[PDB]
């Protein structure tokens, strides 16, 4: 009954998309960030001045400690928590309770930030990324076993320029339009997919396709912006600058905002992904609406560099309906009715295209 799950997320690209969950007995209500870039279920376990509620294990008769803690470190921020298990229910989806591993954060640094509305995180990626180790069964793997649902979830994000949907156990036809296009998961850790080509203003960037997969290309709803490995970032900046022509250096680095819509002055950016048929690609396209982001207008460049990954973050996922088909080791993309600003399209999907002139394997 996927219709219950429609309209179950709040938030946006910048502050995250979050699901309401009930944890323990009696149920304590938390706001949980949906994060396809990690694999732990972790919640505030102590008071923090930037959050309004935390999970108190001592008030839950069904909580059981697992006898160890875990420390998680990100490029920015970290936390240490107690590892236990408890019953969860997701009101907007699964009104029958299920037992999951949970980390209750008792210490942290730059994790719970000012202005943020979530107080834990739901890591939806694979066991290989679970901490302390892959033996700590992920939240979604627990749900699949116990609720006997298909090993698939999908996400509609509607905050382009509001909330959206997290569908656990499959696909809701009302959340997309036209054809679904699927690309293989190259490696089950992050949702790693194979990027063949980037195209700015209809003109491909002149980089070996290995540069787009440098370490990894991934789909991550816990990342705000489109993040590009430094080399790709610098080439994209030059292509966009030249295809527009309005620039201070700070605009590209997020040091400065441009105040003026400007969208008509900037080019389309297309990312080409290998199809489940090896001999074909398809293309996901963001329009300036998704990467020239109004702030209050004043506008920020919605693309940043990464050291180690090309990350298809929430600002790009706001353009599409995205299917995490773990059962068939593929990620699907489709056109999304809610990807609009004033009823105007902010993205395009198209295919197929020939892969005759790209290498057989762009992943190094």
From Swiss-Prot:
**Which stretches are annotated as coiled coil?**
none
Q: How does it sit in the membrane?
A: Single-pass type I membrane protein
Active site as annotated: 35, 220
| Reactions that this protein is recorded to catalyse | Broad endopeptidase specificity. Cleaves Glu-Val-Asn-Leu-|-Asp-Ala-Glu-Phe in the Swedish variant of Alzheimer's amyloid precursor protein
Which part of the chain is the Peptidase A1 domain?
A: 17-334
Give GO BP annotations, semicolon-separated.
Answer: amyloid-beta metabolic process; glucose homeostasis; melanosome organization; membrane protein ectodomain proteolysis; negative regulation of amyloid precursor protein biosynthetic process; peptide hormone processing; protein processing; proteolysis
PTM notes: Undergoes autoproteolytic cleavage.
Q: Note the SS bond partners.
A: 158-338, 209-362, 259-298
Q: Does the keyword Ubl conjugation apply?
A: no
* Functional summary from the UniProt entry: Responsible for the proteolytic processing of the amyloid precursor protein (APP). Cleaves APP, between residues 690 and 691, leading to the generation and extracellular release of beta-cleaved soluble APP, and a corresponding cell-associated C-terminal fragment which is later released by gamma-secretase. It has also been shown that it can cleave APP between residues 671 and 672. Involved in the proteolytic shedding of PMEL at early stages of melanosome biogenesis.
Its protein name is Beta-secretase 2
Lineage, highest ranks first: Eukaryota, Metazoa, Chordata, Craniata, Vertebrata
The UniProt gene name for this protein comes to BACE2
